[PDB]
Amino acid sequence: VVGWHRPTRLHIDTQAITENVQKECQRLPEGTALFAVVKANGYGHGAVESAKAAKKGGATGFCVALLDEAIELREAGVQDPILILSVVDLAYVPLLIQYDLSVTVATQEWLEAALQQLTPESNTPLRVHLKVDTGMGRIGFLTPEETKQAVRFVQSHKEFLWEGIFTHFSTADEIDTSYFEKQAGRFKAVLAVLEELPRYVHVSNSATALWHPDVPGNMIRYGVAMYGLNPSGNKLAPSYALKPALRLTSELIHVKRLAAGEGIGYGETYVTEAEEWIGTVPIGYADGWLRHLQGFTVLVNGKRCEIVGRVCMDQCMIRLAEEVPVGPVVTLVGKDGNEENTLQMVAEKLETIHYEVACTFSQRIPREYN
Amino acid sequence: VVGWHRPTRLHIDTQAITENVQKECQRLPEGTALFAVVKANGYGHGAVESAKAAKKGGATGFCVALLDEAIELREAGVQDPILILSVVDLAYVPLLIQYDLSVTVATQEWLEAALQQLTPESNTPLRVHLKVDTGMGRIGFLTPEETKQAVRFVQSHKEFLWEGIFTHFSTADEIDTSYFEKQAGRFKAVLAVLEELPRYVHVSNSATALWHPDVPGNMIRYGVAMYGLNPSGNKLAPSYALKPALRLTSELIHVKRLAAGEGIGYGETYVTEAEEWIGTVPIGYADGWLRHLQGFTVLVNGKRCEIVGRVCMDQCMIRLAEEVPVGPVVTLVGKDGNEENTLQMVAEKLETIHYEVACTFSQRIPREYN
Numbered sequence A, B: 001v002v003g004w005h006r007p008t009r010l011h012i013d014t015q016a017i018t019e020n021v022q023k024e025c026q027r028l029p030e031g032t033a034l035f036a037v038v039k040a041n042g043y044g045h046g047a048v049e050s051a052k053a054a055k056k057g058g059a060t061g062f063c064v065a066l067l068d069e070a071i072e073l074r075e076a077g078v079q080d081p082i083l084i085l086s087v088v089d090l091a092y093v094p095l096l097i098q099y100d101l102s103v104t105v106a107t108q109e110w111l112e113a114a115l116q117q118l119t120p121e122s123n124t125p126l127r128v129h130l131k132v133d134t135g136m137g138r139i140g141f142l143t144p145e146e147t148k149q150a151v152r153f154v155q156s157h158k159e160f161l162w163e164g165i166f167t168h169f170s171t172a173d174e175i176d177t178s179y180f181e182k183q184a185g186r187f188k189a190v191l192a193v194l195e196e197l198p199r200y201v202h203v204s205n206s207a208t209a210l211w212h213p214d215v216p217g218n219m220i221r222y223g224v225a226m227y228g229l230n231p232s233g234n235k236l237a238p239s240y241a242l243k244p245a246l247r248l249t250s251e252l253i254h255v256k257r258l259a260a261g262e263g264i265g266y267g268e269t270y271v272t273e274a275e276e277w278i279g280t281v282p283i284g285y286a287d288g289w290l291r292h293l294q295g296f297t298v299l300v301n302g303k304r305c306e307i308v309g310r311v312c313m314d315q316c317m318i319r320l321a322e323e324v325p326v327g328p329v330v331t332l333v334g335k336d337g338n339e340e341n342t343l344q345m346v347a348e349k350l351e352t353i354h355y356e357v358a359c360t361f362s363q364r365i366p367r368e369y370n
């Protein structure tokens, strides 16, 4: 299940994770907390290690997207608050108590149904965070009144404890700020009809924390920035230099001299124009190195090489500058000489964002930590 | 790392894999063997349970890409021949002997090197397969004399065994048979200088087996077709009814009505043209439901539902043409009523081949079998 017996490898610089986190904490008021969102296996970097690295930088809470992803954190030994970011089935409400997990709620219907199968006055309250939809449009309460009604209800039952209320931004990372503020208005107006306020009032994410610090709240969910990736993609400049924590390498496992007019790859989409030194790298699209990456250039001995021909499930072919033996290290993501390949670079070639590139990296790729 | 606590599931139909394998086995010259390639964790369907399904279907051997994948097969109780299709780093020759695995060899250098670490009378010969490149240009011996040299060497030292020779086609699923014929030619030459052949002489794949059933050989490496997927996308009609084995479902976890003029998802790339019902499904690009699936329509109660707004890491919102509570089954790949979502459709919307959609589905998605 994990390709340990193949030179293809992912190196993760956890120190970066800590640095990126520390620096952000230094820009936060003494009252603002920093929760490290490590869902989807730390954006493909590794949950536990990201969490562990995250903590050492000031992290005092973590966010995940699944119940069992949290259990893994609990199991891994993290004893800090863990916030599951999306809705969770009622059948699994007991698991939330057993692991003292914090859950997000978006319907009055959920709470009422949860209220049942919950002891009258449990010695273990259910930590709820109310999600308000102020523009994202995926989950949350749409109305200040509903929001408020939700609160009144959670407040009127000791079997609950709402440690939070929050919302999420859909365009924090954009130059035009108009929609952003409209979302903030919707949040203010829904907090506005509230008497009390929980311990956690969060609204910002990586993008928000960087280009909209003034935004209210005593807690922030730091994501991609943790891994040193500009949230805006390329649109704006982070408030501080982010250190990249993802590195991907492999090596040549076959070298060859091809005559002119030899086709390489499926459907022979490529044909030699002349004498060409072609290298065979053991990484395919099943590893995450997608087919549309064809044409992209990777690194070897500090020189760029083009991926020629169709990328395969388990390998691909690159045009080597000059003869070379089997064994030279192939840098796909990272620095090598003067050349460097950023996930942003991979992303732009893939016409997506690095959030996706990173997750797409299969488990078949062993990850090594500094 | 597996989200069993999230209704997003990947249903696999083993019976179908068996049936796809039997169909071909009966269609086969019966003086031929069927090897089932189950790399990339069974093409996303699950290696061990796919293999076993192919066995009871008539398979008598297995192809994988990594030594690791191979050992899994051994530890699982598979006692049939297991051939590793790519080169395997010299450092693991002893494991090869340990798990009596067959290995691919595409150079003379390697062979004379493996010989070093091989004991004259180890009573365990190194079962090798000599891959000759004829077309497709990834690995293998380029010329006849080169293979003649490789062969005469292997038959010599007798720590080896030489189980077979084979090549791989790059255009077998193409309507135009030119390039194919060429590769077949070059492979005829290769075998033409060897006054002898091994147990296995294979060149056939999914594609070649279906549309070029007469090409020379006594064993085929059946891949994608044993999973029910047209090995050519939609260019050619298979030679027999392939039955899809993969299926993907999830379910509505959030439902709301929005008023005309509301934005959904990141960036605000979508706004309600009027009042409408929006559903939220717990599956995102971290699962392998890539961002470019927007506009694609999934199935709810046999009715099509368009994915609106950007696909999130962990979820996506769809436009429900009705009014429905939470819980109805969301069908992303498979049937519902008279509607059908097939991997091909997914591949076409993604602008690639289903081979990749299947291998991209993440580990986190639980795979249910029968």
Ligand SMILES: Cc1ncc(COP(=O)(O)O)c(CNC2CONC2=O)c1O
Pocket (backbone or CB within 6 Å): A037, A085, A168, A204, A205, A206, A207, A221, A222, A223, A224, A225, A231, A355, B312, B313, B314, B315
């Ligand atoms: C509710 C919520 N808060 C915070 C975050 C952290 O965001 P950043 O990484 O941008 O700081 C996310 C992840 N949201 C994303 C990002 O990509 N796909 C998603 O579902 C989230 O869903």
Ligand SMILES: Cc1ncc(COP(=O)(O)O)c(CNC2CONC2=O)c1O
Pocket (backbone or CB within 6 Å): A311, A312, A313, A314, A315, B037, B085, B167, B168, B204, B205, B206, B207, B221, B222, B223, B224, B225, B231, B355
């Ligand atoms: C040498 C070899 N034989 C047989 C197969 C099985 O092919 P089918 O699935 O098409 O029947 C493959 C997989 N080759 C692919 C397919 O995609 N990427 C690869 O490296 C292969 O590499």
